Design a protein around this ligand. Structure first.
Ligand SMILES: [Mg+2]
Ligand SMILES: [Mg+2]
Length: 698
């Protein structure tokens, strides 16, 4: 049981000491002399100068140690983009195919470019192809400016920045930037921000010139059997020589009390004594620049997930569970502390809606996070298999080999190290214990986002709230007693969207099936019945692991269904859109689309029939009918509603009356009751399928 960073470092040294075992004969041709660097910006060119640095990397200024001759950056800043807050809880990683090398749509496995990498300080490196950049020295000073300013940003933005304890976290983030800078220099970096590829294109042009500048012996050595230059080899070395200098400009801003720590294969403690992340100590305390990018990134992803999850949960606790301050709420937004409870009062607006707002958000993050953990898990397998399979060579092989030689042969053994990370391990509560080998619990929706205990809670002076049993029994029950038209139960099954199915798949398979329209559908068999003055719904097929609550109110259920309907309606309108396009364009694949929609459409039509069947078992007062409940919900949720529906405003004020059914509520003297938004939305969507069905027919 060791940390993933400690292990990846231990493997890294074995690679580093292998590089320095051999004494480079051409070392002096690749070692850069800072003082010797030549830079020319727009003003420098205007005024007719060539700026040089002094000895100190710590006295480097972007206004003079840059080649930036562009219009956009007149300030000549190394950080010029969305490089504002990388440690933000809402800062996103990138896992798609377009902006990553090796990540391709087809293969489900993908590496995740952390926010910190996405916004590195290399805008000055986009300027490397020019008449003044032709030496090992020039290049170093460019890497040196980048390292300084990037190292600055990390220190003046870090969460541990003001921390009372040890500032170890700052060094760790620098080590991450250092390694990423290295992979950039080397040509090894996988992030492709734009097809322009200016750092990499320029970085090529520099090394081509460095190569010609070399001696015949050195040129012959850094060459390919065909005579061509082994630019790859040239570049990995240039990094090994210069890396000490790159670590100085980086740690140039690091605080006195920040020290890079790491443990040995045995368990020996390695620390940077002098301080400032080992700034005045020479040789770097890190070997992370000798760890493949993917692993560094995965270890970063895990460590940031664990960190932000603590922030996210705390924001959820703030709106849903602060018993010390008489706070207790449902994820369906109801104050459980209340004497007279809003959760069984169907027409009543919701008290505590900030809780529901927090839960929806938290859930959406945890599922974004889950998708990333799935993608990376698959790539770790793709990479750990690749080493045994391929006979030929690539730079990473040697590392992945060693990893398999340690117990970390498979994903499960490695995910154990991810659990042991500084942030992931730090939990004195087994409620929020992180086990990446238990994706179910670790990617679960918070326990604070559960429905109110049906009877409510009564808070105490002691700083906690207690679950009351059969609370306020028959108190003001005389009023709703006459409003009970049917006390029999009503059973129906509902097709809830469970998108956590693409990932987790082996664990879910049994309970969640993928539909045509969704990569996950959860069939919930409900029994709704009026007991006392509260209509409770029981989940027949209840599974704690996958379903949140066993018992809910009918009001809670309706709104869940209504949330789900809109979502599904949106998805449907989306999948049917190319076929619906007015132009009489024949498409074969369109037939299977409309059939899919009809599959979901019909299910819901059948679903709602049963839900109205339960609604009508109670009287809420004339005009306080389901058509009005549907409007009330759609009004109070105008954001979501506008994203799903085409013209809500015309629908909201649409008066269509239908046959008055068996529905006890219909007390209208032979008059026909008005169609609800749900029924009109379905019956409208239907006509759209009927059109498509006959617009792609043989
Ligand atoms: Mg690609
Ligand atoms: Mg299926």
């Amino acid at each position: 049981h060791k940390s993933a960073r400690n292990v990846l470092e231990n493997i890294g040294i074995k690679i580093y000491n292998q590089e320095i075992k051999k004494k480079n004969p051409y070392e002096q041709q690749l070692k850069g002399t800072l003082s010797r660097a030549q830079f020319v910006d727009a003003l420098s060119s205007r005024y007719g100068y060539v700026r040089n640095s002094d000895g100190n990397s710590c006295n480097l200024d972007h206004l003079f140690h840059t080649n930036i001759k562009t219009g956009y950056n007149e300030g000549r800043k190394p950080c010029y983009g969305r490089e504002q807050n990388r440690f933000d809880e809402n800062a996103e990683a990138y896992c798609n195919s377009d902006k990553i090398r090796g990540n391709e749509n087809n293969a489900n496995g993908a590496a995740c470019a952390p926010p910190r990498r996405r916004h590195i300080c290399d805008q000055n490196l986009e300027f490397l192809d020019n008449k003044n950049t032709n030496t090992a020295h020039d290049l170093l000073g460019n890497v040196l400016v980048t390292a300084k300013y990037e190292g600055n940003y990390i220190v003046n933005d870090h969460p541990d920045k003001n921390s009372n304890g040890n500032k170890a976290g700052i060094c760790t983030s620098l080590a991450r930037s250092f390694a990423d800078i290295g992979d950039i220099v080397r040509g090894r970096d996988m992030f492709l921000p734009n097809k322009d590829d200016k750092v990499q294109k320029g970085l090529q042009v520099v090394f081509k010139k460095i190569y010609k500048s070399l001696t015949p012996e050195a040129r012959k050595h850094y060459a390919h059997g065909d005579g061509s230059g082994n630019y790859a080899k040239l570049r990995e070395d240039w990094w090994t020589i210069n890396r000490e200098q790159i670590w100085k400009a980086l740690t140039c801003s690091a605080p006195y009390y920040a020290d890079y720590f790491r443990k040995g294969s045995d368990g020996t403690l390695h620390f940077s004594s002098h301080g400032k992340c080992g700034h005045n100590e020479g040789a770097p305390p890190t070997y992370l620049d000798y760890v493949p990018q993917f692993l560094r990134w995965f270890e970063e992803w895990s460590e940031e997930f664990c960190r932000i999850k603590k922030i996210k949960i705390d924001k959820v606790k703030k709106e849903c569970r602060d018993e010390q301050n008489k706070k207790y709420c449902s994820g369906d937004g109801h104050d459980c502390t209340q004497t007279n409870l809003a959760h069984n009062q169907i027409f009543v607006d919701l008290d505590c809606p900030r809780c529901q707002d927090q839960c929806i958000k938290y859930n959406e993050w945890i599922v974004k996070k889950l998708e990333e953990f799935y993608k990376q898990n698959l790539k770790y397998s793709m990479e750990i298999q690749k080493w045994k399979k391929t006979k030929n060579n690539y730079y990473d092989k040697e590392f992945y080999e060693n990893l398999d030689k340690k117990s970390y042969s498979t994903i499960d053994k490695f995910l154990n190290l991810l659990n042991n990370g500084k942030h992931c391990h730090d939990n004195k509560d087994e409620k929020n214990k992180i086990d990446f080998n238990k994706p179910i619990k670790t990617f679960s929706i918070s326990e604070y986002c559960k429905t109110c205990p049906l009877y409510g809670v009564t808070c105490t002076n002691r700083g906690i709230c207690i679950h009351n049993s059969n609370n306020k029994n028959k108190g003001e029950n005389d009023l709703n007693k006459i409003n009970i038209k049917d006390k029999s139960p009503t059973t129906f099954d509902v097709d809830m969207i469970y998108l956590r199915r693409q990932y987790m798949k082996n664990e879910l398979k049994s309970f969640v099936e993928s539909t045509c329209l969704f990569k996950g559908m959860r069939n919930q068999e409900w029994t709704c019945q009026i007991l006392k003055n509260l209509d409770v719904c029981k989940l027949n097929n209840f599974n704690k692991v996958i379903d949140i609550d066993k018992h809910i109110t009918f009001k809670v259920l309706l709104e869940r269904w209504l949330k789900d309907f809109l979502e599904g309606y949106k998805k449907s309108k989306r999948k049917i859109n190319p076929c619906t396009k007015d132009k009489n364009s024949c498409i074969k694949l369109c037939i299977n689309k409309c059939t899919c929609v009809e599959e979901w459409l019909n299910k819901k039509e059948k679903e709602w029939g049963q839900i109205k069947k339960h609604f009508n078992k109670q009287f809420h007062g004339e005009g306080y009918d389901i058509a009005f409940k549907v409007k009330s919900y759609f009004e109070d949720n105008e954001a979501d509603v506008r994203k799903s529906i085409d013209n809500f405003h015309v629908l909201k004020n649409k008066e269509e009356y239908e046959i008055c059914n068996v529905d006890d509520n219909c007390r209208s003297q032979n008059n026909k009751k008005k169609k609800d938004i749900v029924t009109i939305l379905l019956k409208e969507l239907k006509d759209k399928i009927v059109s498509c069905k006959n617009q792609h027919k043989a």
